[PDB]
Write a protein that binds this DNA or RNA. Structure first.
Ligand code: B12
Ligand code: SF4
Ligand code: SF4
Length: 376
RNA sequence: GCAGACUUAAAUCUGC
């Protein structure tokens, strides 16, 4: 009965494109609670997580009388077919692989909906509660306890066949399914991810200072701290460094889901056009990727910083207009700072003009930084 | 229609 239901669920999940499925109980996540209290007090959290620790570690609070959790994982592509070349006149930014093609929030919500349907179509009264990323549970904690993959040193859940390049989701049920056993650590004495992290956000194996992680920094809506502006490169959203150096990901390039295939012109887009983009054109072109959940502003800020990184002089006119006309303090100030960074002294007069008119205190400071740079 | 804010992609509010 319960065993047959479990095998039928696994059979259906694979047919609708789930790459890996696993089972765990609805027991509380005790070690996780202690861990979350630790990270919180160390200031190592991001603020993006659920504030209520009880709801995060107690499945039976989320779904009354729950008895199990079904965890699913989908592998996403890692290599890009015919990536467009970034030249001196035409510089390009880059999205992380978790932001290629169709938003996994929607892809995996679909798989969870079909699996909720499947169970509810058989026995009653099977009750469920699904979630992907935006739920209370820790998708990694569930995936680990369900045997999807092991906790690697880069904090990533890593699977034997697909590596770390997988999306995670889970469904809480009232079915007392038989749980699986967690898989073993494959990292060994390797430390490549820890050593290659540009900001040392990986303070220890399996421990992240989220405030120092590039991925987090690309999604903040305010001014990017001076400390990290030199380490973003041309990233527009997220970071893949602790994964692309990982030996467990060598050869892992799976094209199993067509809608996840990146559009090279929007995954690796031209920087300058992003600066003058309209809301409709952004919604049409970027509105269906995961990296647009905070809006266009963090992406544009990063695009500016990316141009400063490249010292693209051809971006100076658009940056200048942005400094003068844009109603967003973060955009004005960053444009001012980038202008000074690119290093053309001819634009110094324009910085002073902007300075004399700025009313936003923080934007003022960024202009002053930009002026100081151009003197040098 | 355009733009901004906000929580988060269409909802709410504001400006043209
Ligand atoms: C907040 C958040 C972030 C934050 C911080 C992530 C972090 N490491 O804490 C930021 C914005 C930086 C981020 C970045 C990324 N994230 Co993110 N993020 C989340 C989110 C919403 C919650 C994660 C969280 O609460 N972390 C807090 C820590 C404490 O817990 P946890 O890592 O989830 O759980 C593990 C630890 O607690 C550990 N642990 C427990 N006890 C102990 C004890 C010891 C001693 C140690 C060492 C560890 C340890 O074991 C748990 C299970 O592995 C989840 C979705 C979700 N709802 O769960 C996605 C999620 C974790 N992110 C994901 C992705 C894809 C990424 C990025 C790769 C995106 C990118 N390309 O930039 C990067 C990777 C950066 C990295 N190396 O961690 C995937 C991870 C998939 C996978 N294969 O593991 C998730 C699961 C989203 C999803 N639904 O697929 N993200
Ligand atoms: S995503 Fe980038 S910044 Fe964050 S821990 Fe990994 S390598 Fe470091
Ligand atoms: S780089 Fe090495 S230590 Fe880091 S996750 Fe990959 S195998 Fe593990």
């Amino acid at each position: 009965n319960v065993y047959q239901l479990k095998e039928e669920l696994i059979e259906y999940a694979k047919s609708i494109g789930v790459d890996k499925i696993g089972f765990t109980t609805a027991d509380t996540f005790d070690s996780l609670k202690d861990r979350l209290i630790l990270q919180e007090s160390l200031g190592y959290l991001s603020g993006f997580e659920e504030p209520d620790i009880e709801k995060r570690v107690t499945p039976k609070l989320l779904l009354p009388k729950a008895k199990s959790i079904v965890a699913i994982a989908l592998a996403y592509p890692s290599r890009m077919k015919d990536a467009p070349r970034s030249t001196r006149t035409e510089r390009r930014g880059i999205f992380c692989r978790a932001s290629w093609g169709k938003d996994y929030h929607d892809v995996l919500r679909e798989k969870l909906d079909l699996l909720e349907d499947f169970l509810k179509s058989k026995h009653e009264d099977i009750r469920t509660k699904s979630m992907v990323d935006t739920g209370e549970l820790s998708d990694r904690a569930v995936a680990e306890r369900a045997g999807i993959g092991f906790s690697a040193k880069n904090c990533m859940i890593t699977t034997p066949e697909y590596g770390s390049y997988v999306y995670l989701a889970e469904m809480i049920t009232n079915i007392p399914f038989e749980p699986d056993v967690p898989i073993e650590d494959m990292c060994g004495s390797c430390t490549k991810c820890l050593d290659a992290c540009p900001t040392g956000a990986l303070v220890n194996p399996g421990q992240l200072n989220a405030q120092r992680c590039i991925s987090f920094l690309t999604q903040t809506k305010g001014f990017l701290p001076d400390e990290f502006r030199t380490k973003i490169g041309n990233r527009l959203y997220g970071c893949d460094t602790c994964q692309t150096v990982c030996p467990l990901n060598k050869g892992k390039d799976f094209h199993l889901h067509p809608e996840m295939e990146p559009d090279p012109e929007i995954a690796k887009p031209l920087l300058k056009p992003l600066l003058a983009i309209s809301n409709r054109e952004f919604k049409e072109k970027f509105g269906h990727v995961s990296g647009s959940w905070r809006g266009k502003k963090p992406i544009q800020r990063n695009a500016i910083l990316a141009l400063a990184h490249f010292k693209d002089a051809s971006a100076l006119p658009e940056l200048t207009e942005l400094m003068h006309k844009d109603p967003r303090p973060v955009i004005r100030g960053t444009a001012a700072w980038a202008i000074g960074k690119i290093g053309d002294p001819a634009y110094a007069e324009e910085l002073e003009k902007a300075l004399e008119k700025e009313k936003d205190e923080e934007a003022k400071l960024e202009i002053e930084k930009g002026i100081e740079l151009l003197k040098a």
